[PDB]
Amino acid sequence: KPHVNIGTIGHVDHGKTTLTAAITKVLHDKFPDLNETKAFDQIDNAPEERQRGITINIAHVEYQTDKRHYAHVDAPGHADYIKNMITGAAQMDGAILVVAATDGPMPQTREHVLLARQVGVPYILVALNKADAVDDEELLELVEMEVRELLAAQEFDEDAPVVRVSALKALEGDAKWVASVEELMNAVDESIPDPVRETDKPFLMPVEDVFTITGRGTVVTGRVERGVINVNEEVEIVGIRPSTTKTTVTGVEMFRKLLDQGQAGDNVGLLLRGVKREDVERGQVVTKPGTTTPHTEFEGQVYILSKDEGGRHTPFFNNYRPQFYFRTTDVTGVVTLPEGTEMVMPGDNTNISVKLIQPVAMDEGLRFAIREGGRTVGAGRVTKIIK
Ligand SMILES: Nc1nc2c(ncn2[C@@H]2O[C@H](COP(=O)(O)OP(=O)(O)O)[C@@H](O)[C@H]2O)c(=O)[nH]1
Ligand SMILES: [Mg+2]
């Protein structure tokens, strides 16, 4: 019964919210287990979400098929999709592209799929909507060519399936189009690959602080993001200071217990053999040995907080010196703007190149904040690393 994060993406007036309403409905009349059929009113008039200091407008919805339980996310505004995806309100494990068969792919449709590659969304599949209105069959055929050629150039594939649906007629109970969105949810079931168990990910916990206890005890604290660790297994601290450390954890303890295994998500304290207190910093990470290494230069995709959200006032140029909150620490780096971009306004999303004065353990698809002395001015995700 795996849990999966998906969402509808596409142009405005193309019927993303309708299909989301149809999807939840089609499974609620067809399942006692599936949650309340949500109506267009409460999905379209989406609530307001504030995460990491950024304001969003996101509609969360849950439903489950017989193969997976899903966590669906929809937004009203296009910019909200820019916000959500880059700032991770939906660490999406799949995505449903919505292409209205009347218009076809529009700038956002390309912009959404493009941005899907920037944040590492593994799969995108297509829901050819509004087929209740298109007479011509060979027009529909071509509408599939433009898309499948949009998804092919953005490193996706022919493997991804296009499903002609009607988000309206299925929503209105028409058994011919109700079955159409039914096939979608089976494609959704099989096409999107199974998202890895956060337990089965390789071990990773960011360091939060460090103290001296007993005589030989130098505890490190943090909440495990990835994986689990067995007591006395070698770990690897990763580069707030320039070097790469290596030590064998000798005791893990959560609250009253002193476990031999800490799970992903647990607030845990790790006692270590072979380093002292002055060898560990916030933002350092205790990885499984050799799984991850710390880089210094990378290529990211960042969203800048706008005037209305308390974002930066002056636009910034190359050789911009902010801090980058990679995990539990603010590391200062310098910017180079992409060829063609001379200035970054508030509001603007952009690709970006960054050189850090520090080394930081990082992988692609890692959220980070951009701050002016603690005050966050933006956020983003790693897209490409260099050196
Ligand atoms: N005929 C038809 N109209 C649709 C369909 N899906 C959505 N619409 C229309 O599209 C309009 C906006 O739908 P909505 O889901 O809010 O679009 P989005 O949120 O921008 O993706 C509504 O007035 C619907 O009547 C469909 O499958 N068939
Ligand atoms: Mg919408």
Numbering used by the authors: 10 to 396
Task: Quote the paper.
EF-Tu is one of the most critical proteins in bacteria, as it is the only protein delivering aminoacyl-tRNA to the ribosome for polypeptide synthesis. EF-Ts functions as a guanine nucleotide exchange factor and catalyzes the reaction of EF-Tu from the inactive form (GDP-bound) to the active form (GTP-bound). The Mtb EF-Tu contains three domains, named Domain I (residues 1–200), II (residues 213–296), and III (residues 306–396). Here, we report the crystal structures of Mtb EF-Tu•EF-Ts and EF-Tu•GDP complexes, showing the molecular basis of EF-Tu’s representative recycling and inactive forms in protein translation.
The final structure contains four EF-Tu molecules per asymmetric unit. Each EF-Tu molecule was bound with a GDP and an Mg2+ ion. The GDP molecule was bound with Domain I of EF-Tu, which consisted of five loops, named G-1 to G-5, similar to other nucleotide-binding proteins. G-1 was referred to as the P-loop due to the conserved amino acid sequence like GX4GK(ST) from residues G19 to K25, which connected the β1 strand and α1 helix responsible for phosphate binding. Also, residues K25, T26, and T27, located on the α1 helix, forming hydrogen bonds with the α- and β-phosphate of GDP. Especially, residue D83 was bound with the Mg2+ ion through several water molecules. Also, residues D141 and A176 formed hydrogen bonds with the guanine ring of GDP. The GDP molecule interacted with residues D22, G24, K25, T26, T27, N138, D141, and A176 of EF-Tu, which were conserved in Mtb, E. coli, and T. thermophilus. Moreover, analyzing the electrostatic potential surface showed that GDP was bound in the pocket full of positive charges. D22, G24, K25, T26, T27, A176, and D141 of EF-Tu shifted from 2.8 Å to 5.5 Å upon conformational change, which could explain how EF-Ts help EF-Tu to dissociate with GDP and reactivate EF-Tu during the elongation cycle of protein translation.
